[PDB]
C-alpha cells in the first residue's frame, strides 16, 4: 500500500477541459468507475458537471449558477460505500488544519497521511497554491480534485492547500466572511455526499493579521466541518517534529488541546 | 399534525430550473394547487415568474426590472383564504426574529413552530444560509420558497435565515439600508397579498458591529414588517433553553421585554 | 368628493410595460382623454415616452438622453387648464413637504390632502418608497403617476415619498446635490407645464447625518420648487397631532414658522 | 432692440436629435444662415457636427474623439465678421463671471446683457443648469446654444451656467482641473474662431468649499480666457444692486477691483 | 532660416483620422518623405501606425496593445542619419524641462528654439496642452508630431507641453508612476531611433502638489531621458527674462545649477 | 563564446503576434528547433501557446484560463537535457536578484553573465522594464523570452527585469502578493521543466516602501525560488563595483552574507 499523488491527474484533465465547446461536453474521459458519482459546481455565473468517470460538461442557465445553487455540489449513487472507513471506524465529512505564523501544515498532513497509510485506508494527495506545486489550486483544481478522488477508490483524500480558494473568495480582503463559510459547508456537505474523509489546510499568509484570520476561520470551520484543528506551535528538532495543537470536533462541541510529534515524511 | 421541510422541494425546483431557456418557460411542474398564486420576482435586470403550479418563466423586458417592480410581488385570486389562521385569530404579515452575540434565533424558530403545530395550523419550515445546511440561501431561494408555501397548504411558513439575502444586498458593507428596508417590505407585503404568516429569522455573524447592525435592522423591521422580536439574553440548560426578548409590535407601536422558554426541539 | 389612490393604477400600468419590446411601443391603453399631455423621462441613456393616453414607447437615441433631456418634461396643448385651481386660487407648481428625526411626513400629507379634498378639488394621492406600501418608488413610479394624474380630472396630486429617487440620485452617498437640484426642478416644471399641483414628501432616513441632510435638501428646495415645508417638531396625542414647522416661499424669498394642529386622518 | 432667448430654439433642436439614426444625420433644419459655421464637439467617445444651418450628424470614430479632438472647435468661412463689434470695440473671445456664497452672478449677468443691448448690439441669452430653468444645462445643451447664436445674426451671447458642466467634468469631485481647463480654453477658442463675444457664468454650489473652487476656476480663467470676473462682495436695496468685484484682463494681465451697481432688470 | 509650427498640420491629420474605418486604412497622404519612418503607437488596446507619409492603420490585435509593445516605438532605414546634428555636434534624444509654481517653461523653450535656429538647425514647435493653444495634447497629438517631424526635414522639436499625457496616465491620482516612466522611456527611445532632438516640457498644475510632482518627474526624466532642466527660480524685466535652472545630464550622472537669462521671444 | 542578445528577437516575434486572428494561428515561425518545448500562458481570460518553433496560437476556453492554469506552464519531450549544465554541475530552475535604495542589479547581472559565459555557458540576456530598454517588460515578455531561450541551445538565462510584471500583478497596491508568489513559483517550475537556469531582477522602485518591498519578495522569493539574493550595499569605485549581499539557498534553507566585486562589464 502506498499514497497516491492526484496533482498529474487534475493537470491532465484540465488540458482537456481548455476547449472552445464545454457546452458540447468533452466525453469519453476514464476518471474513475469504482463509484458512479456527479459533481456539479458553480464557475461564475455557468454550472460546471462532471458525469461519472466519462462526461464533463458545462452549462449557462438563464438566471445566475450563484442564485440557483451558490457553490456546488455531489450526488452519489445508492450502492455508493467507503467500507475501509468503516472498518478503520474513520466518518465521512471534511477535516480543516490551519496555521498561521508557526507553521506546520504541510507537516502535519504528511504525517496523518502516511499514518492513514500504514492504518490500511488507501490515501491520496493533492498539492496545490504552495511553493514548488504546479496546481495554481483554483476552485475548479479544488473540484476537479474532489471528484477525480470520488469516483477512484480513495478512502482519504488531503487537499493542501485552499491558499488560493481563500484569496478568490476575498478572503484577503478586508460579504468576505459569508462565501468562506459558504464554502467550507459545501465542502463538508460533498465529502458527506460521497461519503469520503477529506482533508482540507490553509495558511492564510497572503492577510495583513495572519493570526487573527487563523482564530475566525478556526471558529468558522468550527460550525461548518466535522473537524477543525489549529496549530498553536510548531518545531523541527532534525529529522523530528513536534506541534501543539487545537482541535475542535463538531459532534460533542468540545474545544481540546492536542500534542502530535513524529518524524519528516517527504511528499 | 406535523411540520412541513420545504428545502427539499426547493432544491429540486432549482435542479428543473437549471435551463438555458428560462425565456421559453419550465412548464407541467406540481408546485401546488391549493390557492391560485403568481409570485413575480427581480433577478438582475431579469423578471422571474412562478404561474400557479404549473409554470416558471423569465422575461428580460426592454425597461430594468429594479425601475419596474424593484424587489417582487404575489398576485392572487379573491378566493385566496387561509381559514385556519381566522379560526386561530393570527394576521397575515412577515414577521422578524433578529439576534446577535447571545444567538438562539434557530432555537425559538423551532420552539415557535412546534407551539403553531401544536396549536393546529400547517407549519412549513426552510433552512438556508446557514452551516450543515443544503440551500445557500439566495433572494431566488427565498421568493421559491415563499411561492411553494404559498400555492400549497401552509398556514405558516419558517425561513432561518436571510444572511445571504442580507449578503447580497450589502448589508454587510458600510444606500445598503435602502435596499435591506425595500426587501424586508417587500416580503411583509407578499406575506399580506398571499394572507399567510411567513416568519423571518437573522443574525448579520458576517457583520463587522454584528450587536450594533442588530439594533438598526430591529428598528427597519419595527416599521417594515407585522412584528420585529431582537433576543437580547439566551442560554441552554441541558435540554431547556431560556431567552429575554424584546418584541415590536407595529399595530400598537408598543416595545415589550418578553420572556421566553422552554424545551430544545430538534429539526 | 373623495381622494383617489392612483397607486393601484401605476402597478397595473408596470405589469403592461413589462415587455421586451417598448421600442416598438404599448398601445391601446386608457391613461386617461381629459388633457392632451406627453411625458418625456430619462431611464439611464433611453427616452421613454407616455404619449397621451393611449401611447407608451422606449427609444434608444444616438446620443445619451442624460445629454438630450437630463431628467424629463412634459408637453401639452393651449387648452391644458385646471379650472378649480383658478376658482380655489391654488398656483401651479411642485411644493415638498421634508422631516429627519421628527417625523409626521405622512400624518401632514394626509391631513392637507383632506383639507384640499373638503375645499372642493380632485385630489390624487401615491404611496411608494415606505413600509406597507407596494409601490417601490423608482423615478419610472414617479414619471408614471404624475403622467396618469395630468391626463386625468386631478387637480391635487400628492407623492409620499422620493425616498427611493433620492436614493437612486445617490442622495445617501457623501456630484450628488446636482442630480437632486435637477429632480426638484423637473418636477416643478413639470406641474407647471400640466398646470397642476404636486406635493410631493422626503425623509432622508437612509443617510448617515438625518437632520443634516433634510436642511440641505430643504435649502435646495426653497430654490428648486414654488413651497418648501420643513418639520422641525411632531408630537402625537391619542387622535390628534401638533407640528411645528418651517415654511419657505419662494415668491417672497420669506421663511416663516407656521403651527400646523388636526387629527389623524387614515389612508 | 430687445434680448434674444436662445432657451426655445436649444430645447425644439434637442427634440429634433432625439433619433435612432443620428449617424445618418438629421437634415431641412433651419439653426440660422447669417454665418457659414461648422460646429463640432465630442460626446462621449463619438463626434457630434452642426454644419451650417441645415445638417447635424453623429459619427463614431475608430480611435477615440478624446484622443482625436478633446472637448470641441468651429470653423468658419473667411466672410465671417460682425460688424457691430466693430463698430462698439468689443474684443471676440469668452468671458467668465464666477461667484461662491455672495451670489449674484445672475443679476450682473443680466445687467450686462442689458448694457449691451442699450449700446447697439445683438444680444443673446441662454438660461439653463439653475433652478426654474427648463434647459439641464449639459455641454449638448452649451455647444447647440454657441452654435445657434454663431450661425445667426448675435453679436453677444450670454450663458448662464456650466454649473451642469462643472459638475459634469467631475469638478465637483477632488485630473479634474485638467478637463476644467480644457473646456475653459475650448470655449475661448470657439468664440475667437466664431468671432463672438461669449459670457460664461459659474458658481460652484455643489462643491464642498465653494469658495476655495472660485479661487482656484477664477485663476484658471484667467489664462484660459479673453476676461475673468469675481464677484467677491453682493448686496440688494430693494430694487437696486451693488457688487464688488474683481476683473482679470489677460491681455495686459492686470488684477484690478471693479465696483458694479445698478437696478434689478427680470430675464 | 525660421522655426516651423507644426500645430496646424497635426490638427489636419486628427481631421483626416476622424474615420469609422481606420482598420482599412487612410491611405495617400502627404506626411514627409525626407525620411523612412514608422512609428507604432497603443492607443487602449490597439496599434495605431504611421507608415512613412503615405498610410495610417489602425489594427485590433487578439491580445492588448498593452501587453505587445507598451507604449509606442519608432523602425527606420540605416540611412536616417541628420546631418546638421553631427554638423553641431547635438547628440540624439529626449530632453525634458519642468517647471512648478515658477513657472517659465514656455518662455525657456521659446528662448531655446530661437537659440538653436540661431544655430543654423531646422526647428519645429507644437504647442499643445495649454492655454490659447488649439492642440488639446493627447498621446495621439504626441506621436502625430513627432512622426510629422521625423519624415520631415527637422533637426529639432519642441512639444509644448505634455500636460494632458501626464493627466491621461493618471500622473495627478496619488501603478501611476511605472505609466509615466514608461511613457518618458519610449519617448527617448523614439527621439534615438529617428536620429532627432526632441525637447518635451511639463508642467503639474493640476497636481495636489505641484513642486513635489517636480521633484519626483524630474528623478524619472534624470534616468529615462538624455536630459532632465528643473526651473527652480523665474522671473520677468519688462521685455528681458532669467531663470535659475538645474540640469542633470545623464551620461555623466552631474546635477549642476545653471542661469540662462536672454530676452522674451513670441510663439 | 558570447553572450546573446534575445531582445531584438522578442521584438520581431510581437510584431509578427499582432494579428486579428490568432485564435487560427501564426505558423512558419522560426523560433528554434534545438528542444521541442511547448509553452502555455494564460492572457486575461485566454491562453496564449507557443508550439516548438513553428506555431503560436491563442484559444478563448469556456472556463476562463485562471481557473483553468492560472498563470503558465511548460510541456517537453523526454529529451529535453542541456548537457553543459551537467558537465558545469549547474542545476536548473528559476534565481532572483532583487536590490532596493542601494541598487546594483544590473551591474551584478552582467558580472554574473559574464562570468556564465567565461565558465563555457550558452548565456542570453533580455533586457526590459528598465530606461534606455524598448521592451516594455510584460508578462507576454517574460514568457516569449523564456520559450525563445527555451526552444533553442540556451543554457542560462538573464531577465532583467520583472519590473512590469511586479506593477501588471499589483505589486505596487497594498490579493496582490498571492499574485506574485504564484507567478514566481510558475517561473520556477517553468525553468525545471525545460531545464534551464533562468535568473531573475527586480527592484521595486514604483513602490511607496521600496526596501519593505524587498524584505517581503526575498521572503517569499526564498520559498518559490531556487536562489534569492538580495544587494544590502553597493558602491562604484571608477571601473570597479563591490556589493554587500544577502543568499538564500532553498535546498539547505540557509541565508548567508556573501560580497561580491568586480569590474564593470557594459550590456
Known amino acids: 500500500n502506498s499514497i497516491i499523488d492526484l496533482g498529474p491527474r487534475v ?20 476518471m474513475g468507475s469504482v463509484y458512479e458519482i456527479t459533481t456539479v459546481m458553480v464557475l ?4 460546471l458537471g462532471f458525469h461519472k468517470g466519462d462526461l464533463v460538461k458545462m452549462v449557462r442557465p438563464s438566471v445566475s449558477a450563484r442564485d440557483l445553487i451558490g457553490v456546488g455540489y455531489a450526488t452519489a449513487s445508492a450502492a455508493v460505500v467507503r467500507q475501509r472507513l468503516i ?11 490551519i496555521s498561521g505564523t508557526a507553521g506546520g501544515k504541510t507537516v502535519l498532513t504528511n504525517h ?52 488560493s480558494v481563500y484569496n478568490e473568495l476575498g478572503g484577503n480582503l478586508k460579504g468576505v466572511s459569508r462565501q468562506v463559510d459558504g464554502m467550507l459547508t459545501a465542502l463538508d456537505q460533498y465529502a458527506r455526499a460521497v461519503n469520503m474523509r477529506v482533508v482540507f489546510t490553509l495558511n492564510p499568509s497572503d492577510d495583513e493579521n495572519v493570526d487573527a484570520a487563523v482564530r475566525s476561520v478556526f471558529k468558522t470551520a468550527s460550525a461548518s466541518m466535522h473537524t ?31 500534542r502530535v510529534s513524529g518524524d519528516l515524511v517527504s511528499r
Not at 44 to 47: A, E, L, M, Q, T
Request: net charge negative; charged share 25%.
Open 44 to 47: 461564475g455565473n455557468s454550472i
Open 87 to 97: 472498518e478503520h471506524k474513520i466518518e465521512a465529512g471534511a477535516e480543516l488544519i
Open 11 to 30: 493537470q491532465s484533465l484540465m488540458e482537456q477541459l481548455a476547449t472552445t465547446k464545454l457546452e458540447e461536453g468533452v466525453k469519453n474521459l476514464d
Open 112 to 163: 496523518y497521511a502516511a499514518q492513514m497509510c500504514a492504518k490500511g485506508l488507501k490515501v491520496a494527495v493533492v498539492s496545490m497554491a504552495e511553493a514548488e506545486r504546479p496546481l495554481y489550486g483554483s476552485v475548479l483544481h479544488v473540484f476537479a480534485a474532489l471528484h477525480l478522488a470520488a469516483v477512484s477508490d480513495v478512502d482519504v483524500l488531503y487537499v493542501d492547500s485552499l491558499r
Open 228 to 258: 477543525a484543528r489549529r496549530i498553536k506551535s510548531f518545531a523541527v528538532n532534525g529529522t523530528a517534529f513536534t506541534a501543539e495543537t487545537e482541535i475542535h470536533l463538531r459532534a460533542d462541541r468540545s474545544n481540546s488541546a492536542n
